[PDB]
């Protein structure tokens, strides 16, 4: 239900006494939160709408040269000068050319020569500032139960119904309480100022395409620019980055414009993240949050209901959702209305012992009609298993085999934890932390390592990371001394940082 | 204003705060209430279920002065290094603000 088929779904379980759990909501990812006696609630960060942007230094990328002019002065007769040099919309450059009696002088030598050129930018790009107090994170919430595959497990959430909730997260309202009808309320305690460090990220505007341009990259662009606080003719500081004053044969100085720098800055933007803009607000498609989930008010609906009588029907044949969980759909045929489906996993079904755990806690049919659909989710153990979704002789079972093992599960969890550490950095220790002396000491020493690594190297590309990793590998394979752990921690910390892409 | 009582509810978060180049956060609030001389319950707290005061307060003993409907106030708090919340109320109608 809105998070069951996404490949970046992780499972967080267990709380500190059923009170709170700490989680990190990725922007492309989803988090499925399950508990013991509380219903399974899916979280999905959908958007990041940044409003109220003010402009910064806006660069030009397509220039033009108007009617140019040039004039020389005789040698030992002063320096050349024009009245059109007294405007800021004219670029110029002084040079020394040959001058003779065929050139009209009366003294042979290297006379001064000034060539003016009226600058006129046609199309310019714009950088905008991102304030950290203007982030608006939208969080979709959906609990597992009483849903179909149609308008209940899709994006139909533009209303106020049960089992679906949306909340906006500002820094002015960092906590939220989504109202789930019958299920209680999930308490969010998000920390939106600890996003993707938005004090050093700008917002580019070029050709109706937008990026999350880093600030230190944006402050060092060699292009003509004005300060952005102008609604007329711009001043265009540093006009000499797109014009070229080329002496042909020391007889005539021609000035030509350079080409449009659109493709030269699209190739220079090899590290920004593309965003969109739906007006004056900037919708992002990336980032991460930091939320604590108060789960004390989340209650389970449908525990007092009775069982179903009989007649379950197997429609929408179940498949594996790329993690080991099996989305199982049923069509219950009966007129009980509010009944409870006795769904369970079972190995060696003559004993009917529940062995595999269940994701959708307390599955409930709501509709009082004859044909009633339901969308479940079950996780089998590694080996042969049956899906018993009925009671009595009219149960329907399903032969299911989750391919894998326990140590393969732990190896895949180690790979997922390494990718989660390579994406988040310091915040990856608070993804399933319930509060302890190891998830706050490990996060502290990883914060020390991140502050000592992002300040030290901090600027390596994807290829240069592997290029210095080969050097650190060769320095780890030799120089047998006490400093061999420095050549292996900074080897793996760059190699897994560069290879997990 | 040590003899004043605490506030009841209904604060308003105007003038979204910032850092004054030293780690201090100057926070403006608008107490929507006619209680008069009440004392503002401001504290800096991580782990919002506990509300443990971790950061010290610069403007000691903040006091609402005006007895009208919307009495303004300007405070200053020193959060610790890391993540924190500016909890400037009591009860259930309190408003908070995350600060890093």
């Amino acid at each position, epitope marked *: 239900i809105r998070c069951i088929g996404v490949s970046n779904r992780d499972f967080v379980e267990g709380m500190s006494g059923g009170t709170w759990v700490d989680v990190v909501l990725e922007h492309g990812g989803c988090v499925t939160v399950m508990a013991q006696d509380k219903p399974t609630v899916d979280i999905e960060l959908v958007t990041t709408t940044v409003s109220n942007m003010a402009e910064v230094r806006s660069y030009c990328y397509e220039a033009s040269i108007s009617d140019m002019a040039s004039d020389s002065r005789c040698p030992t007769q002063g320096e050349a000068y024009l009245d059109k040099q007294s405007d800021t919309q004219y670029v110029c450059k002084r040079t020394l050319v040959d001058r003779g009696w065929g050139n009209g002088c009366g003294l042979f030598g290297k006379g001064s020569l000034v060539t003016c050129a009226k600058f006129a930018c046609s199309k310019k790009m714009t950088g905008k500032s991102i*304030q950290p107090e203007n982030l608006e994170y939208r969080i979709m919430l959906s609990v597992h139960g009483s849903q179909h595959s149609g308008m209940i497990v899709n994006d139909t959430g533009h209303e106020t119904d049960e089992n679906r909730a949306k909340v906006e997260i500002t820094p002015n309202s960092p906590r939220a309480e989504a109202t789930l009808g019958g299920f209680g309320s999930l308490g969010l305690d998000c920390e939106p100022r600890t996003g993707l460090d938005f004090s050093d990220l700008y917002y580019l505007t070029m050709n109706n395409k937008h990026w999350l341009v880093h600030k230190e990259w944006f402050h060092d662009i060699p292009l003509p620019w004005h300060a952005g606080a102008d609604t007329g003719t711009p001043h265009w500081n540093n006009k000499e980055a797109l014009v070229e004053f080329k002496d042909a044969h020391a007889k005539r100085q021609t000035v030509v414009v350079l080409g449009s720098q659109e493709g030269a800055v699209h190739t220079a933007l090899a590290g920004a993240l593309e965003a969109e803009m739906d007006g004056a607000k900037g919708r992002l498609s990336s980032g991460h949050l930091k939320c604590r989930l108060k789960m004390d008010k989340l209650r389970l609906k449908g525990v007092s209901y009775s069982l179903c009588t009989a007649a379950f029907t197997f429609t929408k044949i179940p498949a594996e959702t790329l993690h080991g969980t099996v989305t199982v759909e049923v069509q219950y045929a009966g007129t009980d209305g509010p009944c409870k489906v006795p769904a369970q996993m079972a190995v060696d079904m003559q004993t009917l012992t529940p062995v595999g755990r269940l994701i959708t806690a307390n599955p409930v049919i709501t509709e009082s009609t004859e044909n009633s659909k339901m969308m479940l989710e079950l996780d089998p153990p590694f080996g042969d298993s049956y899906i018993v979704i009925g009671v009595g002789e009219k149960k329907i079972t399903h032969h299911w085999h989750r391919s894998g093992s326990t140590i393969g599960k732990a190896f895949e969890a180690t790979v997922r934890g390494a990718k989660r550490m390579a994406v988040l950095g310091d915040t990856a220790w608070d993804f399933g932390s319930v509060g302890g002396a190891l998830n706050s000491l490990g996060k502290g020493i990883h914060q020390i390592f991140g502050a000592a690594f992002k300040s030290l190297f901090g600027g390596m590309s994807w290829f240069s990371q592997i290029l210095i990793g080969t050097l650190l590998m060769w320095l780890g394979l030799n120089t047998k001394n006490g400093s061999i752990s420095l050549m292996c921690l900074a080897l793996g910390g760059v190699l897994i940082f560069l290879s997990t892409a | 204003g040590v003899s004043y009582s605490l506030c009841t509810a209904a604060f308003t978060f*105007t003038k979204i705060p910032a850092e004054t180049l030293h780690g201090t956060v100057t926070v403006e609030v*608008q107490y929507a209430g006619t209680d008069g001389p009440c004392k503002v319950p401001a504290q800096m707290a991580v782990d919002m279920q506990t509300l443990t005061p971790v950061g010290r307060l610069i403007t000691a003993n903040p006091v609402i002065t005006e007895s009208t409907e919307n009495s303004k106030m300007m405070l200053e708090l020193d959060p610790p290094f890391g993540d924190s919340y500016i909890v400037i109320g009591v009860g259930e109608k309190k408003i908070t603000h995350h600060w890093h």
Partner: antibody, heavy 122, light 109 residues
Framework: EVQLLESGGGLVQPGGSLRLSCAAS????????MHWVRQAPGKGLEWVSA????????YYADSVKGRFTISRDNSKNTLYLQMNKVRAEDTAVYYC???????????????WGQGTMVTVSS | DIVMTQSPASLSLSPGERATLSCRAT??????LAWYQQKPGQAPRLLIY???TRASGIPARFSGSRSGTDFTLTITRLEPEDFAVYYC??????????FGQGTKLEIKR
């Protein structure tokens, strides 16, 4: 109390130059920044120009930039809005706004004058 | 480029009811707004400093609020000696501050 008297009345002929002299007295006007707000008949208010606490600095609006220059005498606490190149769009009621400024141009409590009937007729 | 627009400009209401006047902005002016009170033929006064606190000699029946770039007035009881023209003012960054347009208040007759 708040006493911002204005002077320099009459009419402004097209092509000349006059001075609107605000006789500001009753406060320490060496720190109070001074402003000038129009009042167009039938339309809203217009912001014209202002003088900062420091003597050298002075700003105007973009529609009246380079035409109306002001001067403050610190020994007199007065203003002189030089009405150079007056066109037909200056038919309004000028005022004098004075407020305290820690920075260049700011006020927390504003003061006002009584107005000056300045029209253009040929 | 920040033009203070007022919506609405006239409300045919009775003295004693409420009145909400809003001033808008284009860029991100956070809170620094100032309302004014101008009777025709008299000197203009203010209404509220930072849309929350009035001047010396102005009662607390007139207040404002902050909502993004819009600032709505909250008037408890309208008096017949209070219907005049009201303006807004910019006090963000560097001047010239931009005034609104002028909001008059009409009565039934």
């Amino acid at each position: 109390e708040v006493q911002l008297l204005e002077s320099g009345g009459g009419l402004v002929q097209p092509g000349g130059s006059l001075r609107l002299s605000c006789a500001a007295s009753g406060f320490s006007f060496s720190t109070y920044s001074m402003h000038w707000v129009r009042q167009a008949p039938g339309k809203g208010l217009e912001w014209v120009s202002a003088i900062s606490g420091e003597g050298d600095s002075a700003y105007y609006a973009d529609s009246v930039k380079g035409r109306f220059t002001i001067s403050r005498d610190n020994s007199k606490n007065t203003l002189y809005l030089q009405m150079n190149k007056v066109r037909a769009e200056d038919t309004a009621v000028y005022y004098c706004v004075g407020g305290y400024s820690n920075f260049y141009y700011y006020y927390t409590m504003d003061a006002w004058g009584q107005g000056t009937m300045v029209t253009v007729s040929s | 480029d920040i033009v203070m627009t007022q919506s609405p400009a006239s409300l045919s209401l009775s003295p004693g009811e409420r009145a909400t006047l809003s001033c808008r902005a284009t860029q991100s002016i956070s809170t620094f707004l100032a309302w004014y009170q101008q009777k025709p033929g008299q000197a203009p006064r203010l209404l509220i400093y930072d849309a929350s606190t009035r001047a010396s000699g102005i009662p607390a029946r007139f207040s404002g609020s902050r909502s993004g770039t819009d600032f709505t007035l909250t008037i408890t009881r309208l008096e017949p000696e209070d219907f005049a023209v009201y303006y807004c003012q910019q006090r963000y960054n560097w001047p010239p501050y931009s005034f609104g347009q002028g909001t008059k208040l009409e009565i039934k007759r």
